[PDB]
């Protein structure tokens, strides 16, 4: 039952051109904040990650989708907020590496240890460290791992795989890139093979392609990783209808959803940003991607389904949800694809907050693994990188810039970024914290050994 308030509205209250019209607040917040502070146990935890969703990304998406004075009913609704650092480590010196990749940062909040770019579930000495999901399982809690990316991708993989390189998707890549993790060499196996061992109750995302590979050793040698999953009691789903049909998910009948060969389709389509794209060409208006359709579950749908199936566990559950393509489209200098995935994440957050407020003992956290490239710049900007003009909900033009790479892919940035929470122990994301603190916050909130 509700007691801890979720922000109902932080949109501009009135006429932004008039006095007080742009205010997002309507009164003193001292009482609301006191009502948002509780150190009682968190029975469940829902961690939503917007890959590469730094403050710049959130703002850009709000400006376009909700207007500058708009409000994300999900993402902007968490009452307790802070900024956290996500630097990685140089593998050889052990010193800080100011700009992390996704594997090292995900490893940080999932295990509580800093590591080098490319590492998954291991530290700079390549020592494995239990993940919050594995720990949740060990304590008897149900577990969920959701993502719009291929499941072998760094973010969701970090919770169930321990490999020296995030490139080790299946047996093939592992034998070549992670010889020490290769199953035929006595290791724990590829990311996909370990994911199958982790056996989370609910796992949803893309990445069906790798399951086509066959094991090089072990009990299921010669069989495809898909056959192995089937043989190990997994219930495989491939689309919205089949997913909807699922009535239960547990260790006896673990759910594995493979909704795309690789990454799942993005929500919006738009051209890539170009050189002086905001000076020469006209303004862009994003448009829905036909490849999305109803046969493909949305992030909000996968979130709702996971909560349903996971909440059946009376002891509690841990669930991670990732809006993976915000980062990917940021890399491809594509504003529409980028913003569309942020809107996507916001819906997933709303579903989490909606459940969390009713349940009353659920901690919800929303943040990103690292900052990214996109910047909001003046309309008449003449930049050296890639830019694009966009027609926002405000009926005005917003220009986005990607200027940190001459190479084909735009890159991550080291700036600290927003982390927000709601529920029991949400106080621990306020002020300045580190990405590794999040692991300890989740561990403590659930009261894990």
Q: Which of residues 104-163 bind a second copy (CB under 8 A)?
A: 108, 111-114, 123-124, 129
Alpha carbon distance 80, 57 (integer Å): 19
- The answer to whether 215 and 222 have CB atoms below 8 angstroms apart is yes
Question: E strand or H helix at 45, and its extent?
Answer: strand 44-50
Determine how β-strand 80-85 pairs with β-strand 431-434: parallel
Contacts with Mg ion, 23-52, as mask; x by CB under 5 A: ----------------------------x-
Q: 433 Cβ partners below 8 Å, 6+ apart?
A: 82, 83, 84, 85, 419
289 in contact with a second copy (CB under 8 A): no
Contact with Mg ion (CB under 5 A) among 63, 102, 174, 329: 102
Query: Which residues within the stretch 333-372 sit at the binding site for a second copy (CB under 8 A)?
Result: 371
Give CA separation, 243 vs 156, 209, 249, 259, in Å. Answer: 19, 19, 11, 9
Q: In a 10 Å sphere around its CB, with 0-12 CB exposed, 13-18 middle and 19+ buried, how is residue 93 labelled? A: exposed
Given candidates 327, 341, 347, 437, which one binds Zn ion under the rule CB under 5 A?
327
Q: Which stretch binds Zn ion (CB under 5 A): 161-169, 364-372, 400-408, 419-427?
A: 364-372
Q: Minimal distance in Å, beta carbon 135 to a second copy?
A: 13
283 near a second copy, judged by CB under 8 A: no
Tell which positions 371-410 bind a second copy, by CB under 8 A: 371, 373, 375-379, 381-385, 392, 394-396, 398-399, 401, 403-407
Quick one: what does residue 324 bind among Mg ion, Zn ion, a second copy, none, with the CB cut-off 5 to 8 Å set by partner type? Mg ion
117 binds Mg ion (CB under 5 A): no
**Residue 298 is a binding residue for a second copy (CB under 8 A):** no
Given candidates 82, 121, 277, 340, which one binds a second copy under the rule CB under 8 A? 82
How does 173-182 read in b/e, with b if 16+ C-beta sit within 10 Å?
bbbebbeebb
Q: Which of residues 294-333 bind Mg ion (CB under 5 A)?
A: 324
Residue (18 or 314) nearer to a second copy, CB: 18
What dihedral angle (degrees, nearest 10) is formed by the CA atoms of 365, 369, 373, 375? Answer: 20
43 sits near a second copy (criterion: CB under 8 A): no
Among 181, 369, 373, 387, binds Zn ion (CB under 5 A): 369
> How many angstroms separate the CA atoms of 47 and 318, rounded?
8
Q: What is the DSSP string of 169-214?
A: -SHHHHHHH-TTT-GGGTS---HHHHHHHH--SEEEEE--GGGGSB
The packing angle between helices 102-111 and 435-446, to 10°, is 30
Across the strands, what pairs with 255?
202, 235
Instruction: Indicate which of Zn ion, a second copy, Mg ion, none lies near residue 437 (CB less than 5 to 8 Å, by partner kind).
Output: a second copy
Q: Please count the residues of this chain forming the interface with a second copy, following the rule CB under 8 A.
A: 107
Options 98, 172, 232, 292; binder of a second copy; rule CB under 8 A: 98
Q: Which stretch binds Mg ion (CB under 5 A): 99-107, 270-278, 382-390, 409-417?
A: 99-107
Instruction: Report the residue number, 112 or 337, with the smaller CB distance to a second copy.
Output: 112
């Amino acid at each position: 039952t509700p007691e801890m308030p979720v922000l109902e509205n932080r949109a501009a209250q009135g006429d932004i051109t008039a006095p007080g019209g742009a205010r997002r607040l309507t009164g003193d917040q001292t009482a609301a904040l006191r009502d948002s502070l509780s150190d009682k146990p968190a029975k469940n935890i829902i961690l939503l990650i917007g890959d590469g969703m730094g403050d710049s990304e959130i703002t850009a998406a709000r400006n376009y989708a909700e207007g500058a004075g708009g409000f994300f009913k999900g993402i902007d609704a968490l009452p307790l907020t802070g900024q956290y650092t996500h630097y990685a480590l140089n593998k050889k010196t052990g010193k800080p590496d100011y700009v992390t990749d996704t594997a090292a940062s995900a490893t940080a909040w999932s295990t509580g240890v800093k590591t080098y770019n490319g590492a998954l579930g291991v530290d700079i000495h390549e020592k494995d460290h239990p993940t919050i999901l594995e720990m949740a399982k060990a304590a008897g809690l149900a577990t969920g791992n959701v993502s719009t990316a291929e499941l072998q991708d760094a973010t969701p993989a970090a919770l169930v795989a321990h490999v020296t390189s995030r490139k080790c998707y299946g047996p093939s890549a592992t034998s070549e890139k992670c010889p020490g993790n290769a199953l035929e060499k006595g290791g724990k196996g590829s990311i996909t093979e370990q994911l199958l061992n982790a056996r989370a109750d609910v796992t949803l995302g893309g990445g069906a392609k790798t399951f086509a590979e066959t094991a090089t050793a072990g009990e299921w040698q010669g069989k495809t990783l898909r056959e192995q999953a089937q043989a190990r009691g997994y219930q495989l789903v491939s689309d919205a209808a089949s997913l909807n049909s699922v009535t239960e998910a547990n260790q006896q009948k673990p759910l594995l959803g493979l909704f795309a060969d690789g990454n799942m389709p993005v929500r919006w389509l738009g051209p890539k940003a170009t050189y002086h794209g905001n000076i020469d060409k006209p303004a862009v208006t994003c448009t829905p991607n036909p490849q999305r359709n109803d046969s493909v579950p949305t992030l909000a749908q996968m979130t709702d389904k996971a909560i349903e199936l996971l909440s059946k566990n009376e002891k509690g559950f841990f669930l991670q949800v990732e809006g993976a393509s915000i980062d990917k489209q940021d890399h491809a200098a594509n504003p529409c694809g980028q913003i569309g995935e942020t809107v996507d994440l916001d819906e997933a957050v709303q579903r989490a907050l909606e459940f969390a407020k009713k349940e009353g003992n659920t901690l919800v956290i929303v943040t990103a693994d690292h900052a990214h490239a996109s910047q909001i710049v003046a309309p008449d900007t003449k930049a050296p990188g890639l830019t694009q003009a966009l027609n926002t909900k405000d009926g005005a033009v917003m220009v986005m810039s990607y200027g940190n790479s001459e190479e084909d892919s735009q890159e991550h940035t080291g700036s600290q970024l927003r982390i927000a929470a709601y529920g029991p122990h949400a106080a621990n994301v306020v002020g300045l914290t580190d990405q590794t603190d999040l692991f300890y916050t989740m561990k403590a909130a659930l009261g894990l050994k």
